[PDB]
Design a protein around this ligand. Structure first.
Ligand code: ACP
Length: 706
């Protein structure tokens, strides 16, 4: 896949009548469950018919209406103003297209992931250096270990709707659990290890995760950094959700004078407004301001008996500390294996204990289906088709509606606590999968090194999702691309023959400080690189040029944010009409109706609008800085903010799951933040300063909001 000419961009852009267009590609990039018996299949151009696999064994072909057929009930739905639904009624799975598909298509021994640990042997590789820890993960191992994780989550009592929180380093085990969570429909939240125990506590509370998966520690810069004792433990122990503190506050308050009780509730509520979880002390300090005010006698009359005030302080204290457990169990990966790890016998589980038991359950089920596998060694001797048949015996894949939530990732906003955006299985997977051949030359078998952490959207969408979806080996790195020296990322490229490089900008500018760092990069053979990209911050044309001369010529710039789900502004592989200069410019993809608008008191407010509205802006002039916007939705865009948990209920019957109609997360807060900027029109407003150029290119100049 790739766009040839400048004519092609514009043919596709107008051709992009949302439904028909994205529908054409989604049939091909990812597989769908189609009706005979049900089968995972996709439209294969090389075969011009739907190829695929039986949902209970091996490979057939289904010829029903092939180009025209639609595995969904309706491609595109535009009835609500910003609440879009793509491929409704279609059953798919992020886990299947990321794991099972490729084993099941005869690429089991292929390298899904290359993992590199942080620690470094300078003298390895004849003085060039090598990692201390490193592993190549076959697609069959990724399927086995994740299927084991899936059964472990089930054994913990998790159902298809429930939610988990991951607080882990970039290591292979996080992927295993993540892909295992997808296999069971369990929605997860990756919490990067750089945040604070109170951030992790807020994301647990808000996601409603009753299980957490963390680690004992990781290795950052050749030093053992604890994880569980420093994040998960305090987040669960030392914080409670504000509605729980109030509930317990009401219980404590129930031999009290109603006027005194009322003052106490409001006093604490104002100190907790906007917060998600807080330390129990924040509540007490609030009570002390209310009691001291009552002892004064000046508020709401009343006069607390010194004894009564003390009794209240005791009842409220005792209730907050005896709060109920926030989590049913915490899973702990042994990774650093440091001594004297704080342990809670009532909730802590060693991941290996649970995954091993999950293997025996996996092996027993296979034997009940007649495979004759006494041990994991026997299993990893079957063919690809029979290997995956055996896995399905005990850990089948759950097929979820296209709009089923895949994960919840939090990103900081202009006001208030960071919010969690939802990404579904359907549009999200088919969308990012398409950007790989469109922006890079990414074909199956290639290798991609994405400098990222699964806690970031680059981690979720490209390090993991777009890689496993495209059958492109991904390099998992535990540490920084410049530790110990500036040539670390170059060494990885050389030794694994990386073909695609996706990273930020800061690591390079730190390289350009002293000239000595460049020499370290020049040690390594980067000829395997056919494209790199910038993607996380504004890059100066000086950086891009430096990187063009010393890493790879085709070092493009790409713009997108957590909400975008995948790249929306990039450069096109093997295209003719679109040049590439060291100007930090980017092009909008055809399905992206990007434009730059600006507030103007005298507002024509009649630009490119496919969806208008009632309730001052104008199309910015070439070279005029304003807001960057998208006027038409697309599949892999976030659907809503995570909310309305009370009405999130999954219909789970058999190995099929859907979200009971009527749930749209916190729809209101979603539209207000992203879609209700421009009066008169419906357009997505990411909040970034960009400016259009005559040749159809864009240049970004930083965040516009706060
Ligand atoms: N090519 C680019 N040029 C300039 N700024 C960019 C950019 N790409 C992203 N940004 C900026 O990054 C911000 C997005 O924050 P977010 O963290 O969700 O995306 P990201 O690219 O940083 C994911 P990650 O943390 O994985 O790197 C954008 O809002 C925008 O300010």
């Amino acid at each position: 896949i790739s766009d040839r000419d400048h004519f092609q961009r514009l043919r596709e852009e107008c051709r992009s009548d949302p439904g028909e267009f994205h529908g054409r590609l989604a049939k091909r990039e990812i597989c769908w469950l189609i009706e005979g018996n049900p089968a995972w299949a996709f439209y294969d151009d090389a075969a011009e018919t739907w190829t695929g696999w039986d949902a209970s064994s091996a490979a057939p072909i289904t010829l029903d209406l092939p180009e025209s057929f639609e595995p969904w009930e309706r491609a595109f739905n535009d009835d609500d103003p910003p609440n879009w639904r793509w491929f409704e009624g279609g059953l798919t799975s992020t886990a299947f297209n990321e794991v099972d598909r490729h084993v099941l298509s005869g690429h089991g021994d292929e390298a899904a992931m290359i993992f590199e640990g942080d620690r470094w042997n300078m003298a390895s590789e004849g003085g060039r250096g090598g990692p201390v820890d490193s592993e190549v993960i076959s697609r069959r191992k990724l399927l086995l270990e994740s299927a084991k994780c899936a059964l472990a989550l089930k054994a913990l009592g998790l159902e298809a709707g429930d939610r988990i929180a991951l607080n882990m380093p970039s290591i292979p085990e996080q992927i295993y659990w993540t892909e295992g969570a997808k296999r069971m429909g369990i929605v997860y939240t990756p919490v990067f290890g750089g945040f604070s125990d109170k951030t992790l506590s807020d994301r647990i509370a808000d996601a409603g995760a009753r299980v957490v998966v963390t680690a004992d520690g990781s290795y950052r810069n050749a030093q053992m950094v604890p994880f569980k004792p420093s994040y998960t433990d305090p987040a669960l122990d030392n914080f409670i959700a504000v509605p729980v503190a109030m509930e317990l506050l009401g219980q404590a308050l129930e031999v009290v004078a109603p006027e005194h009780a009322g003052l106490i509730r409001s006093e604490v509520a104002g100190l907790l407004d906007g917060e998600v979880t807080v330390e129990r002390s924040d509540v007490m300090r609030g009570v002390g301001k209310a009691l001291t005010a009552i002892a004064s006698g000046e508020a709401a009359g009343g006069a607390m008996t010194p004894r009564q005030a003390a009794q209240l302080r005791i009842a409220i204290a005792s209730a907050l500390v005896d709060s109920p457990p926030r989590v049913d169990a915490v899973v702990v990966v042994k990774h650093t294996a440091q001594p004297d790890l704080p342990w809670n016998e009532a909730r802590d589980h060693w991941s290996h204990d649970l995954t091993a038991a999950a293997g025996e359950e996996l092996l027993k089920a296979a034997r009940d289906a007649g495979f004759d596998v006494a041990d994991e060694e026997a299993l990893l001797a079957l063919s690809d088709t029979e290997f995956v048949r055996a896995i399905w015996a005990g850990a089948p894949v759950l097929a979820v509606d296209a709009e089923y939530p895949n994960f919840i990732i939090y990103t900081s906003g202009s006001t208030g606590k960071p919010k969690g955006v939802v990404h579904v299985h359907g549009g999200y997977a088919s969308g990012v999968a398409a950007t790989m051949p469109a922006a890079f030359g990414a074909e199956p078998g290639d290798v991609m090194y994405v400098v990222a952490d699964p806690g970031w959207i680059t981690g979720q969408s490209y390090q993991i999702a777009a890689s496993l979806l495209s059958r492109v080996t991904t390099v998992i790195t535990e540490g920084s691309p410049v530790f110990p020296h500036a040539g670390r990322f170059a060494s990885i490229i050389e030794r694994y023959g990386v073909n695609v490089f996706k990273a930020g900008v800061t690591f390079l500018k730190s390289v350009m400080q002293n000239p000595e760092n460049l020499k370290d990069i020049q040690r390594y053979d980067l000829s395997s690189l056919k494209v790199a990209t910038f993607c996380a911050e504004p890059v100066s044309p000086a950086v891009q040029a430096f990187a063009m001369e010393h890493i790879t010529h085709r070092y493009i710039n790409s713009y997108w944010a957590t909400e975008h789900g995948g790249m929306v502004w990039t450069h096109f592989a093997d295209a003719d009409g679109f040049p590439l200069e060291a100007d930090a410019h980017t092009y909008p993809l055809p399905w992206i109706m990007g434009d730059v608008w600006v507030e103007d008191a005298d507002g024509s407010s009649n630009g490119p609008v496919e969806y208008e509205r009632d309730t001052p802006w104008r199309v910015a002039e070439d070279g005029e800085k304003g807001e960057i916007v998208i006027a038409l939705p697309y599949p892999y865009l976030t659907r809503t903010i995570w909310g309305d948990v009370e009405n999130f209920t999954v219909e789970h019957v058999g190995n099929l799951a859907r979200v009971a109609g009527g749930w749209r997360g916190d729809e209101v807060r979603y539209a207000d933040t992203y879609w209700r900027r421009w009066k008169g029109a419906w357009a997505y407003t990411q909040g970034d300063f960009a400016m259009r150029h005559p040749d159809g290119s864009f240049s970004l100049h930083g965040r516009s909001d706060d």
